[PDB]
DNA sequence: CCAGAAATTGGCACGAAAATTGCAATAAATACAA
DNA sequence: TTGTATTTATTGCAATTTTCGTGCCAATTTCTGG
């Protein structure tokens, strides 16, 4: 929605593709990720749970 | 350099062709010590794994 | 015995003058041209299947 | 000390949601001929 | 004046599969009163 394209698009875009960063190298599939859903209608990204865990 | 006390003479061959012979005196005195240093590196890189 | 292996970022994200800035690897990047002495050729003077070709 | 009771764990299940993959050729702007 | 052949401009929809969280319960480990 952001950059007006088909999901199909930004899928097959961000397959096998590296970004490098101070915090060091991810993959950019890295960045998706389920959620929990936190007290108060917000959510909690399960990348922050198991970090938090 | 340093100032040295020297004769000119030979003494049973150990100055045979520039050879120097040198005091004790000269070396427990550290009059010829020098100070040498060096360097070492460690780098720490990011892998995929 | 062994050495680690790397893989290259195509990404590159850093914070340049306190905004997050993000561009393209250029040592990985793709590209192509086009061979100017052959292309300097396609004109009806010659034969006409080498024109189609 | 012991045996019953309580707590822990992970395999399987289930509905839903998210990600992946098959499809293969058209539509419109432009320049030229009567 | 227009009708037509040529050259750029097109990077989405819709099945199908896979993954998500969370419940049920048996097997396993730990705790406690007589």
Request: net charge negative; hydrophobic share 35%; charged share 20%.
């Amino acid at each position: 929605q952001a950059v007006e394209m088909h999901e199909s698009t930004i899928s097959r875009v961000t397959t096998q593709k590296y970004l490098h960063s101070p915090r060091g190298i991810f993959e950019l599939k890295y960045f998706f990720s389920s959620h929990v859903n936190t007290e108060g209608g917000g959510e909690a990204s399960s990348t922050a749970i198991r970090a938090l865990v | 350099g340093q100032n040295m006390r020297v004769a000119f003479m030979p003494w049973n061959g150990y100055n045979f062709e520039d050879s120097i012979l040198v005091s004790e005196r000269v070396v427990q005195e550290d009059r010829f010590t020098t100070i040498h240093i060096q360097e070492l590196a460690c780098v720490s890189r990011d892998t995929k794994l | 015995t062994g050495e680690p292996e790397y893989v290259i970022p195509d990404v590159l994200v850093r914070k340049h003058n306190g905004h997050w800035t993000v561009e393209l690897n250029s040592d990985s990047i793709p590209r192509l041209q086009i061979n100017q002495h052959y292309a300097s050729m396609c004109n009806n003077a010659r034969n006409d299947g080498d024109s189609q070709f």
